[PDB]
Amino acid sequence: IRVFAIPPSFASIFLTKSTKLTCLVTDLTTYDSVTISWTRQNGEAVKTHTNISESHPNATFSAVGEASICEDDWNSGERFTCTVTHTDLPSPLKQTISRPKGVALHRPDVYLLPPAREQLNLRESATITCLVTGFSPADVFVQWMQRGQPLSPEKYVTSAPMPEPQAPGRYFAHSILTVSEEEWNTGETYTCVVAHEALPNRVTERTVDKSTGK
Amino acid sequence: IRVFAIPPSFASIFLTKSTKLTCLVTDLTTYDSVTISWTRQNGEAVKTHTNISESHPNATFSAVGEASICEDDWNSGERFTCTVTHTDLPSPLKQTISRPKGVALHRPDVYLLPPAREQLNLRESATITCLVTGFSPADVFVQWMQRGQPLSPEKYVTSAPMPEPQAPGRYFAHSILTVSEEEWNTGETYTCVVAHEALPNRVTERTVDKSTGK
Amino acid sequence: IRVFAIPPSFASIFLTKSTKLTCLVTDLTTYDSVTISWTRQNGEAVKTHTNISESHPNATFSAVGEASICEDDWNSGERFTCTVTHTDLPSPLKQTISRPKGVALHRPDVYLLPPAREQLNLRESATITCLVTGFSPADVFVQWMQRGQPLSPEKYVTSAPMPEPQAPGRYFAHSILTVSEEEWNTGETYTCVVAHEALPNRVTERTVDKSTGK
Amino acid sequence: IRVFAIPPSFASIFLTKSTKLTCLVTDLTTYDSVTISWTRQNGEAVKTHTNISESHPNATFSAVGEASICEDDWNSGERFTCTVTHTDLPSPLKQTISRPKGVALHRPDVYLLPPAREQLNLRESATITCLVTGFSPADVFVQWMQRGQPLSPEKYVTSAPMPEPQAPGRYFAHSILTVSEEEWNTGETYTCVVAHEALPNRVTERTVDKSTGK
């Protein structure tokens, strides 16, 4: 029985085009008359509450906290919390949700890697990785395109940003794309963009063909 | 005030080269008169119990249950549990520790990929990517050797094995090995053995070099 | 009329995935009333001794002594011998069954060698061989797998461990996989794993292709 | 106490350039005044027994029984035993050695394999193997050439010939040459030769270079 705190991961904020700090409950079971407030330690209204999601009764609740907030105001670094005024939990919960300060914005040195000879001698799949490397902010979102048309995570997956061991301050992350080898062997561009807050343009892209990778 | 059930992770059992099943407390901070033993539902004890690691660096007591168990009996589907005779928790917590045989037997199709030409061009780093793919049991231990001597875990870091975007049952990890640009452009070979129980060999590997980097 | 001692060879323990030490009679042709036991220098017996064998088609009885032994205490080197209590030989025989503890721990520097053009000149066979070199402990189990599936020992066959000519303390083996030339030249990969007890991962393998070598 | 019979294998016929049937005691620790005569119930050929190599340095005597006889007479398949009339062993033993007269014919399919392409990166010990397969006799003598000059047996190790897995009537062996990569990459023609019994040529030979192998 605890209100889960969900800081806005850059993946989610670039999926929904807006920063999203929420307080969704995870282990909270069926308790009717859900009264959960969105106020700080001083008391302030909600920044344009929108996108109410239904509470699926499958042994959990969905305490709505979704809101659209300006990215500049998000990067200004304001302290805010989701106090709990529910009947089950009357005591407030301290959920300090903001980007980790004391951080140097280091852009992701992005290296897109075509597959090696080991898929050329098997001809079953070409798992092409857009390995992002060396960026101090942890969260990052990697998605791909065929030409300019984006590609869904049903063919690819962005691995979690576990830290880089050579530079403890920086992190890295990872992402693949698993499709047929023939579709990659047509000389068609798989252009992986990399959304990150430390980039100057906030989105940088690399492309590989059958000839771009040597 | 709860006891965690640490199972033998395949990474830890190949780190110590032995199956290590333990009943280690996590939230027990300071309570004397520790009495811990291994009694199962049938009523037999383990061969030995020793090698207590005293206390954590934090003020938290650690009481491991350490015994020598062969890989064959662990893989055969044994049923042991660690009773809680300790004074603070007189009720024995049910901790059924077993190797999950519900997973299938899919070997890691390892696709080791060389770093990008851009990774070369930046003249800064060289991250060599052991991109494994498609093993239905998740737990793997991917460690690297420069020529046969394993590197420290502070050099290679393996991604937690997350499902393949195509096959849900088949998992894939991804262990980079971040070094300097010169350390890979000097033609240094890089092998990454992928320890996994579903393999008939229990260890498979690929190699990468400038010659095989297309 | 002599009771032979069968120590657990690394090849057999890798074949059956368990360490098993027996006292199997070889010179005992036909002598009934077999009541074998296991008494060491202390008062300890086997954990489980079952599946006895009565007789062979030839005139040689097979009194097996298979048991489940833990790898950890096998490596630590517990002393255990099979006492002989038989009508023919009532006198017990001392059989100190353990690996030589005084020996180096040097991993097999494995090299996988593709066949030369002389092999493809005849178009009769193509034997890719697994040149393993320099492993100080005794036994290796070098089994082969094309693609990923291991082959039967009727297609590959490994050399018995012979001393390495450079280091007297380090041994040597050499294991073929004689497949057909039409099977080899179709892009089919060939890998060979090397089970050995001084490897940090206990198994190392190399891969070869026609495109791999020059 | 036992007496062992050492047949003259194919190593001797190319080492001393003669066949040397022997009967050598192995377990005989200390028993002086030996009475040995190389006699049979039907004496046919004894030749010479004029050389005795004193005693072994260890706790055993060396009563060598060498006899350099005609090669054709040894290949004809004659039986000759070493009966023991010693005081310690009044009962004669069975020391029966003779080459199998009925053996099929098959050339040694020798194929010389240069080491792995990654030996250029290892720079520790390049090992060229003289991969010989499918010779119908049990044993062959594989030695090496420094541009045509024999190498020492402490430099090359000849793999013990076990049966070829394709046909039980054929056998295969090896011989590696632990040399340095620096002297291998100077264009040194590393040459191996394989001796043989059933061939009309009896010596086959292959050469390897950097350019010879593909």
Short mmCIF file of N, CA and C in Angstrom, two decimals, chain A residues 110-116 127-131 144 184 192 206 208 213, chain B residues 113-119 127-129 131 174:
data_model
loop_
_atom_site.label_atom_id
_atom_site.label_comp_id
_atom_site.label_asym_id
_atom_site.label_seq_id
_atom_site.Cartn_x
_atom_site.Cartn_y
_atom_site.Cartn_z
N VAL A 110 26.28 9.63 -30.21
CA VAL A 110 25.43 8.57 -30.76
C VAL A 110 26.18 7.86 -31.87
N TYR A 111 26.27 6.53 -31.76
CA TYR A 111 26.94 5.69 -32.75
C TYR A 111 25.96 4.63 -33.22
N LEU A 112 25.57 4.71 -34.48
CA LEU A 112 24.67 3.72 -35.07
C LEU A 112 25.49 2.62 -35.72
N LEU A 113 25.23 1.38 -35.33
CA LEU A 113 26.07 0.24 -35.67
C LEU A 113 25.33 -0.68 -36.63
N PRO A 114 25.77 -0.82 -37.88
CA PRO A 114 25.20 -1.87 -38.73
C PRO A 114 25.59 -3.24 -38.21
N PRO A 115 24.81 -4.28 -38.51
CA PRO A 115 25.15 -5.62 -38.02
C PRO A 115 26.41 -6.16 -38.68
N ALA A 116 27.04 -7.10 -37.98
CA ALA A 116 28.31 -7.66 -38.42
C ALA A 116 28.07 -8.78 -39.43
N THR A 127 19.74 -7.39 -36.53
CA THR A 127 19.46 -6.64 -35.31
C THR A 127 20.41 -5.45 -35.27
N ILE A 128 19.93 -4.32 -35.78
CA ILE A 128 20.75 -3.12 -35.94
C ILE A 128 20.59 -2.25 -34.71
N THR A 129 21.70 -1.89 -34.08
CA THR A 129 21.68 -1.17 -32.82
C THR A 129 22.09 0.29 -33.00
N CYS A 130 21.32 1.19 -32.40
CA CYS A 130 21.68 2.61 -32.29
C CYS A 130 22.22 2.86 -30.89
N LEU A 131 23.47 2.46 -30.68
CA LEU A 131 24.09 2.53 -29.36
C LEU A 131 24.42 3.97 -29.02
N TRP A 144 13.34 5.15 -34.41
CA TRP A 144 13.95 4.99 -35.72
C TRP A 144 12.99 5.51 -36.79
N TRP A 184 16.94 -4.71 -44.94
CA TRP A 184 18.14 -3.91 -44.74
C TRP A 184 19.08 -3.97 -45.93
N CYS A 192 18.07 6.39 -37.13
CA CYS A 192 17.73 6.40 -35.71
C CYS A 192 17.95 7.80 -35.13
N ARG A 206 21.40 9.38 -36.92
CA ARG A 206 22.42 8.72 -37.72
C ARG A 206 21.73 7.71 -38.62
N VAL A 208 22.29 4.32 -41.55
CA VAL A 208 23.13 3.28 -42.12
C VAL A 208 22.40 2.63 -43.29
N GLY A 213 27.81 1.56 -43.60
CA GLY A 213 28.66 0.86 -42.66
C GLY A 213 29.77 0.09 -43.35
N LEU B 113 28.72 -7.11 -32.51
CA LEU B 113 28.78 -6.06 -33.52
C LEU B 113 29.95 -5.13 -33.25
N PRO B 114 30.73 -4.78 -34.26
CA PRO B 114 31.86 -3.86 -34.06
C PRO B 114 31.36 -2.43 -33.87
N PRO B 115 32.17 -1.57 -33.25
CA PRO B 115 31.78 -0.16 -33.11
C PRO B 115 31.67 0.54 -34.45
N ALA B 116 30.95 1.65 -34.44
CA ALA B 116 30.65 2.37 -35.67
C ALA B 116 31.88 3.07 -36.24
N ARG B 117 31.82 3.35 -37.54
CA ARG B 117 32.82 4.21 -38.16
C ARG B 117 32.83 5.59 -37.52
N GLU B 118 31.68 6.06 -37.05
CA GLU B 118 31.64 7.31 -36.29
C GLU B 118 32.34 7.16 -34.94
N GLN B 119 32.15 6.00 -34.28
CA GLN B 119 32.90 5.71 -33.06
C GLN B 119 34.40 5.77 -33.32
N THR B 127 33.19 1.34 -28.09
CA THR B 127 32.29 0.47 -27.35
C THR B 127 31.95 -0.73 -28.22
N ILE B 128 32.39 -1.91 -27.80
CA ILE B 128 32.19 -3.13 -28.57
C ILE B 128 30.99 -3.86 -27.98
N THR B 129 30.05 -4.23 -28.84
CA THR B 129 28.68 -4.56 -28.43
C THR B 129 28.39 -6.05 -28.63
N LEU B 131 25.82 -8.17 -28.76
CA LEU B 131 24.36 -8.12 -28.86
C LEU B 131 23.82 -9.54 -29.00
N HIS B 174 22.49 -7.26 -23.47
CA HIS B 174 23.43 -6.56 -24.34
C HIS B 174 24.56 -6.01 -23.50
#
